[PDB]
Amino acid sequence: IRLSRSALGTAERRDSEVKPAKDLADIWRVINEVNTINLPTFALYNVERSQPFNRNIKDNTGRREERFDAYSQTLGGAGRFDHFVEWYIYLHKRTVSDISSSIKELEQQVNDLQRTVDGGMVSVKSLLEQMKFKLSEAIERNDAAVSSRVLTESVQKSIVEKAICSVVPSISNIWVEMITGSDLVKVTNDGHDVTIDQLSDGQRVFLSLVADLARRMVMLNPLLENPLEGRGIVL
Amino acid sequence: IRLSRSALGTAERRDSEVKPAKDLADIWRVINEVNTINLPTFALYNVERSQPFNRNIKDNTGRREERFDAYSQTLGGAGRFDHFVEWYIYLHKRTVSDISSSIKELEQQVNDLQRTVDGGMVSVKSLLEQMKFKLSEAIERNDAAVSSRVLTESVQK
């Protein structure tokens, strides 16, 4: 593939030879639409990254949930970290809003006080064994899935969280809080739970790069056990 | 109460008398500031309520609701749809297992997405049970300003 351009005020204009790239991408697109395949990732992280703030506007831009949103502004120079935050909050809502994906944590959460209230602390049961009634209520809120109950969105969220925690040294965990009912993302830096906007320049920029790359890899590789092992080129 | 105005350039300006209205409003304000009382509501819904208003309200829901926020924009752009949707979603997020006091946003913080991670952080309601005795010193502290007592977010939704 050759990109060519002639200077201003030149009678003879040079053309570009981009046909083979179109042919290869046509192969990818046609095969993918007929039967889902793993798509390559093309990202550019130039100096336009490290911009301040996050999630500036609601960004009505095309439904971050859909797969081909991973190619939007992918080579712009600055990763769309607002897109990542919106997608992460989407994943958290999908995970916590499924009875099958909530009864699993309800069952585990109930079988944690027994490991604690049995030893003592009679004050950690008044408003905590009431949550056992919620697990009992989940029985009548269910019996429609019975089997499976393995959400794809939960797997994507876990993969992205593991990648973020493994690559970024200071960050140990990342999650979404809904109480105080603005949606906000919190991380753990050096053992301290801090929100996403109080990061420093160097831990927020690197996290933005890693999170955007992980999101695009996960969205473009749905048929891989580890989506981050997909192929692509990153600048 | 008489509201008066004179045309610009007139030698003599008509004066409006608003003293008795101020007296009644002072009665209301002082009695409320000593002991909580139910206050009147004055709302105007003009034809501009249907127009889609723009306020750049993104993450503006820090929303420390005081009792006197009901008098803000009450005779102007009061009944807007986007504000209702935003407030309703915010309140529903807060209302889920409604516990939220000035302190219980921390109890729900340690009882949600915590209580499952390792590291000897099993502390749930344990460290702040002595702070839970400050709940009366906390939930009554928000309305300790007796002029600003409101209902809970569930009796309000």
From Swiss-Prot, chain A:
Keywords: Antiviral defense, ATP-binding, Nucleotide-binding
GO terms assigned for molecular function: ATP binding; ATP hydrolysis activity
Membrane recorded as keyword: no
Membrane in keyword set: no
GO BP term, pick one: double-strand break repair
Function as written in the Swiss-Prot or TrEMBL entry: Probable ATPase component of antiviral defense system retron Ec78, composed of a non-coding RNA (ncRNA), a reverse transcriptase (RT), this protein and a putative HNH endonuclease. Expression of retron Ec78 confers protection against bacteriophage T5. At multiplicity of infection (MOI) of 0.02 cultures slow growth when infected with T5 but do not collapse, at MOI 2 cultures enter growth stasis.
Protein name: Retron Ec78 probable ATPase
